[PDB]
Design a protein around this ligand. Structure first.
Ligand SMILES: [Mg+2]
Ligand SMILES: [Mg+2]
Ligand SMILES: [Mg+2]
Ligand SMILES: [Mg+2]
Ligand SMILES: [Mg+2]
Ligand SMILES: [Mg+2]
Ligand SMILES: [Mg+2]
Ligand SMILES: [Mg+2]
Ligand SMILES: [Mg+2]
Ligand SMILES: [Mg+2]
Ligand SMILES: [Mg+2]
Ligand SMILES: [Mg+2]
Ligand SMILES: [Mg+2]
Ligand SMILES: [Mg+2]
Ligand SMILES: [Mg+2]
Ligand SMILES: [Mg+2]
Ligand SMILES: [Mg+2]
Ligand SMILES: [Mg+2]
Ligand SMILES: [Mg+2]
Ligand SMILES: [Mg+2]
Ligand SMILES: [Mg+2]
Ligand SMILES: [Mg+2]
Ligand SMILES: [Mg+2]
Ligand SMILES: [Mg+2]
Ligand SMILES: [Mg+2]
Ligand SMILES: [Mg+2]
Ligand SMILES: [Mg+2]
Ligand SMILES: [Mg+2]
Ligand SMILES: [Mg+2]
Ligand SMILES: [Mg+2]
Ligand SMILES: [Mg+2]
Ligand SMILES: [Mg+2]
Ligand SMILES: [Mg+2]
Ligand SMILES: [Mg+2]
Ligand SMILES: [Mg+2]
Ligand SMILES: [Mg+2]
Ligand SMILES: [Mg+2]
Ligand SMILES: [Mg+2]
Ligand SMILES: [Mg+2]
Ligand SMILES: [Mg+2]
Ligand SMILES: [Mg+2]
Ligand SMILES: [Mg+2]
Ligand SMILES: [Mg+2]
Ligand SMILES: [Mg+2]
Ligand SMILES: [Mg+2]
Ligand SMILES: [Mg+2]
Ligand SMILES: [Mg+2]
Ligand SMILES: [Mg+2]
Ligand SMILES: [Mg+2]
Ligand SMILES: [Mg+2]
Lengths: 402, 131
RNA sequence: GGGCGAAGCCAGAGGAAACUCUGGUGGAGGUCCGUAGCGGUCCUGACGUGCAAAUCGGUCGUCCGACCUGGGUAUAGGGGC
RNA sequence: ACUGGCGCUGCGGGAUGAACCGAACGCCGGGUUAAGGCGCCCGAUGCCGACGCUCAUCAGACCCCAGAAAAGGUGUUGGUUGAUAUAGACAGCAGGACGGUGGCCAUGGAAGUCGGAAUCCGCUAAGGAGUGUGUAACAACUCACCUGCCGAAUCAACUAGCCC
RNA sequence: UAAACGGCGGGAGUAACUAUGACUCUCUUAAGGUAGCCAAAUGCCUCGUCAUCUAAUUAGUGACGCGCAUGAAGGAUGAACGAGAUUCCCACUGUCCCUACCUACUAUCCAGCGAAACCACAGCCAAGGGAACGGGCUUGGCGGAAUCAGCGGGGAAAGAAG
RNA sequence: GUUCAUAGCGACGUCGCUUUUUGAUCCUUCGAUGUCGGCUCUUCCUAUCAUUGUGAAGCAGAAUUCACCAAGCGUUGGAUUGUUCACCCACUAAUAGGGAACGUGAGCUGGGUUUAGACCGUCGUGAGACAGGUUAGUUUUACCCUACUGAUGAUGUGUUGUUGCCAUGGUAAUCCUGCUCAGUACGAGAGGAACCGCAGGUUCAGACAUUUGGUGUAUGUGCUUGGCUGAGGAGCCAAUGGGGCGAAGCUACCAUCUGUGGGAUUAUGACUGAACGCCUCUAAGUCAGAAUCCCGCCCAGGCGGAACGAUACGGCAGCGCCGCGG
């Protein structure tokens, strides 16, 4: 008989293999459709989830309650040191799908990049690409490389560049760089090969890939929660307190017929560490990173047009469980999948952004830099020392400091 | 124009809130909330600025055994106000109105939430203060 | 271990008497709360190839009485009790 | 009730199946059949098989048997009966469609059309004192009835095949 | 002889507004239900009717009474009492909205030790037919070693000659 | 139905379908298939309540009614009752109907029925009975096979690694309100829309912890009871002694963020155009066309492929290519 009252289904069947992701990086799975009329550009980037904070800005949404008003909005900081291009892949269109046609790797592959090719770097002889790089010098190898480029030019439909991150610039323990194929869009195959060939061994900063106040897609793996039951995994209703063999369960897992448990019934297992793709994440700010012209510049990270405070994006006492952010960063609006220091893929939007939520100019008034390691109440060190005055440890130090 | 943003409700069906107007009613017993489609097992809940159906449990005897439209003007549950302000009141209070939105009474004791005042101009006129 | 405080008694006051009122004393009761004991309400809890062929946890009923209990005796099957 | 069968019975066919159809049985070789089949599963039409019917945006496809009726179709195919037509059919395009009489009794207007009876005559090319629309009612249209242009076949009612 | 077992009925007429029948005829009985009480733990019809309690009450209370089928050694009351049945109110709260987090012991992995229930053979489905709900058969879908933690849809699971 | 059979209905008759009613039967089960309801949860059907696209009206507008394509999505909170049903309150776009062993008890519960105790009414001389009322009444086992959920692995490419492709399977978004249009069209008036646009919400989904809230044995830091170490100081025990505040982490529509594009077409309305010298959306040939359908986006990734890297000694030690060398 029919269930007595209608209720919507718990959870989505569009994410059914609710399993641990087979990858840790998070792959793009769909690059923006290429049109030759556009200029040659990259479509993706790799960043690392540093942490969250909130900002104050004025909204320019006419007809809204918050028009010309101040709002406080949570943001996510994604540290994005420049990518290094080390290779080019060409793909050819076949009636069986895209297939890899030819791959050409640059000379002088970085040491952190070469770590990706080894499961045990410590015991390795570091021999990877040692014989390959020799063919960039002799004329016989150089002729073969030119044929590989010419063959890519006349046969391939889409080309991609292999780019890796720079572990030495991050406060993380991992020294193994993250490799990634980033599709090159916007031109003829000959033009994008010439463009990519100039970028070999070069650094591509994030401001060359993405821009201010544009909406991108974030691809990554969510936080792992381990083995979970149906109440936490599928958010089903808890059974009453009087239930004998347990109440954090699903009471009926199917009718007598079809005499099997259907794939659509909520059951316990892995929760979290799933590959997810969130679209429409606006870029509130692209931070400029630390410089040294005469002294170290940090103002270009958290000072606004209305703050004018010499402070960086780093909270007081540092980002919790991440470290200190010293490179370029992207300030995304809202939350982003993954733990701290989880590698994230930023991808250009596959859609056309025409709504007024998109194409809206973002002008920050304030960036919060209070300590996130507790209920922080001070934006900067200097503000805290001015408020509290000298302390006992300052006195005993100044006593020794004469 | 501009519509009301979502706020934390905190007043399900069966909550007894204070009656802040001079109608002689002392409390309002919420029996349903206007505009609630529903969900299996979910109680219809209201925040400030929400029109509710309420009966007065104590007060003048000519108001008791009836159903009155009412609007929540204060709530004890904290709610975010789109500028990072989490505001809550000392008590849950509401006033008795009609379906058109004007009050049966003529004065309001205590503050009225800004979310309720903007959405109901007849309530806002009788408000001593808007918080 | 506490609570209530029956009769009996003392003092004071009011009364013509009959007697009445107040403060103490006294310590009754198949009296009350509640240990040990005895019992076994509910969780329809635990367990349910158990610790256990009836147990365990909490919560409970009664706890000076038709009370609890050892040993010795008597009643034996269409019989006992 | 009658005969046969299954029970007690295997085998060929009915995809499958106690009972249907063929045929009943020692172990084998050759030949030929039954009922049933012969695109491929799967033996056999890999015939230069014959004549038609049928298009389904739920086609149909073999005893028992495993799904359908009344009622419809200007789908198509046959058939039956009747009718018109070179004294010019049919269909299209274009006219008259009246007088008594805005006939009698119904009346508050019902005038040809809210209703009851009867169907007159003349003009003729025809006209119902009306098949319908409609006007409060008039009025204005249309039909059945005839005429002109048009120059060869057409119209109607049934019926039963497949299909819907 | 009923503080023995027990039992305690129908049709006619009738009061000066009407309405009922105090009151009388008969049939019948041994007497024909008195005092009381009630949709009661006793009322089918029935969620009876009225009032109250609620926004809304097949519940509760009060009242009514031709009561299928109330009733006097048991009827009706009435304090105290009850691990008895029921209804409402205040207070209280994770019972709930609507779930979350923490702790102990498990489960889990390891060293050692080490059972039992049950067992035709076994173990992926759809439809068909069939002892009319197949794991096996027919037709199709298909089918890839060895396993771990869970799980309760099936095995018309086990338990017991319903 | 003011006229008018057929907008909407349909008497007298008559043809069907369905198995969500109750019967009829007794084929399976009596060496047992756990017997009502509720809870939870999934899926399916359509005879469509709402929502999308439409045709019709006795469709002026608003509202409503009939029908078509259509099951994508939704169809709620409560009082009484064990109830299924029922009824009322209130919200709502709507509060449609059903199946799955009258789905679902090694999932629960045990209110009901249906053991043994007991009370009442009626029946019986009685024991006792009552699809009459009432009260109290043990809900056992998974560690097996499969299914499903996750987790290692396995076949082949010489070994091993990096980067990838996509067969196939899943699939997701939904509905409402306000402003404007606009007191506008329409209408005598009363009343009273819609398209574009803007701002938001509901249900659902996927996340996340900056903020707010919850937790808190960091047993972190104060306070405090009883006891104990002769006292102070410093501590400990009381199965976490109690309590205030509490980092990190986890976590809440109880905080915050995000949720999407095409194609062929259905119904339907048309174009050209015969059949049938006229007409005709249809016969041939064309057009527009949707919450449906398929794909995209998104999730997984084949006993399915690709490209590329490095490929075994400081000693006799392995390996690759060349020779069609024996
Ligand atoms: Mg339904
Ligand atoms: Mg239980
Ligand atoms: Mg923090
Ligand atoms: Mg519920
Ligand atoms: Mg006592
Ligand atoms: Mg006692
Ligand atoms: Mg007992
Ligand atoms: Mg128990
Ligand atoms: Mg026999
Ligand atoms: Mg024989
Ligand atoms: Mg035979
Ligand atoms: Mg045979
Ligand atoms: Mg057959
Ligand atoms: Mg032979
Ligand atoms: Mg054959
Ligand atoms: Mg053959
Ligand atoms: Mg006598
Ligand atoms: Mg009486
Ligand atoms: Mg009675
Ligand atoms: Mg009763
Ligand atoms: Mg109640
Ligand atoms: Mg009563
Ligand atoms: Mg009386
Ligand atoms: Mg089957
Ligand atoms: Mg037997
Ligand atoms: Mg027996
Ligand atoms: Mg008529
Ligand atoms: Mg039988
Ligand atoms: Mg059994
Ligand atoms: Mg069973
Ligand atoms: Mg239909
Ligand atoms: Mg059932
Ligand atoms: Mg079961
Ligand atoms: Mg059970
Ligand atoms: Mg019971
Ligand atoms: Mg009994
Ligand atoms: Mg008797
Ligand atoms: Mg009991
Ligand atoms: Mg185990
Ligand atoms: Mg697909
Ligand atoms: Mg779906
Ligand atoms: Mg102390
Ligand atoms: Mg001390
Ligand atoms: Mg000690
Ligand atoms: Mg102790
Ligand atoms: Mg706290
Ligand atoms: Mg939320
Ligand atoms: Mg034409
Ligand atoms: Mg058409
Ligand atoms: Mg088209």
């Amino acid at each position: 008989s029919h269930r007595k009252f209608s209720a919507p289904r718990h959870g989505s069947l569009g994410f059914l293999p609710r399993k641990r992701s087979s990858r840790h990086r998070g792959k793009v799975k769909s690059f923006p459709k290429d049109d030759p009329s556009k200029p040659v550009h990259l479509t993706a980037f790799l960043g690392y989830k540093a942490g969250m904070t909130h900002i104050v800005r004025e909204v320019d949404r006419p007809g809204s309650k918050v028009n010309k008003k101040e709002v406080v909005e949570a943001v996510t900081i994604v540290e994005t040191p420049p990518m290094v291009v080390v290779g080019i892949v060409g793909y050819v269109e076949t009636p069986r799908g895209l297939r890899t046609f030819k791959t050409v790797f640059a000379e002088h592959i970085s040491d952190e990049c070469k770590r990706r090719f080894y499961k045990n770097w410590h015991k390795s002889k570091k021999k990877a690409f040692t014989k390959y790089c020799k063919k960039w010098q002799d004329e016989d190898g150089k002729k073969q490389l030119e044929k590989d480029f010419s063959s890519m030019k006349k046969y391939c439909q889409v080309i991609r560049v292999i780019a890796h991150t720079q572990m030495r610039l991050l406060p993380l323990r991992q020294k193994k760089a993250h490799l990634m194929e980033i599709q090159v869009n916007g031109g003829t195959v000959a033009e994008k090969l010439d463009w990519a060939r100039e970028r070999l061994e070069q650094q591509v900063p994030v401001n060359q890939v993405f821009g201010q106040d544009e909406m991108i897609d974030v691809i990554g793996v969510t936080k792992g929660k381990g083995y979970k039951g149906v109440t936490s995994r599928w958010h089903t209703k808890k059974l009453p307190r009087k239930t004998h063999r347990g109440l954090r369960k699903v009471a009926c897992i199917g009718a007598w017929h079809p005499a099997r448990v259907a794939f659509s019934v909520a059951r316990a297992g892995q929760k979290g560490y799933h590959h997810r793709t969130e679209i429409n994440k606006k870029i509130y700010k692209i931070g400029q990173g630390y410089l040294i012209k005469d002294g170290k510049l940090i103002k270009n990270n958290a000072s606004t047009d209305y703050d004018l405070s010499d402070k960086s994006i780093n909270p007081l006492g540092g980002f919790v469980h991440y470290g200190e952010v010293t490179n370029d960063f992207v300030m995304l609006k809202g939350c982003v999948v993954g733990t701290k220091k989880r590698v994230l893929t930023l991808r250009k939007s596959l859609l056309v952004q025409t709504k007024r939520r998109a194409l809206e100019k973002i002008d920050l008034k304030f960036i919060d830099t209070t300590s996130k390691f507790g209920h922080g109440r001070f934006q900067t060190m200097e503000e805290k020392k001015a408020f509290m005055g000298p302390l006992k440890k300052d006195r005993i130090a100044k006593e020794e400091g004469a | 124009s501009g519509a009301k943003f979502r706020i934390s409700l905190g007043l399900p069906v069966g909550a007894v809130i204070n009656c802040a107007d001079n109608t002689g009613a002392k409390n309002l017993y919420i029996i349903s909330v206007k505009g609630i489609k529903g969900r299996l097992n979910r109680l219809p809940a209201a925040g400030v600025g929400d029109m509710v159906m309420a009966t007065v449990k104590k007060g003048k005897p000519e108001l008791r055994k009836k159903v009155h439209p009412a609007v929540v003007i204060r709530q004890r549950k904290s709610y975010r106000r789109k500028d990072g302000v989490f505001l809550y009141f000392e008590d849950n209070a509401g006033v008795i109105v009609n379906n058109k939105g004007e009050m049966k009474g003529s004065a309001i004791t205590g503050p009225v939430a800004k979310e309720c005042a903007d959405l109901w101009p007849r309530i806002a006129s009788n408000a001593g203060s808007i918080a």
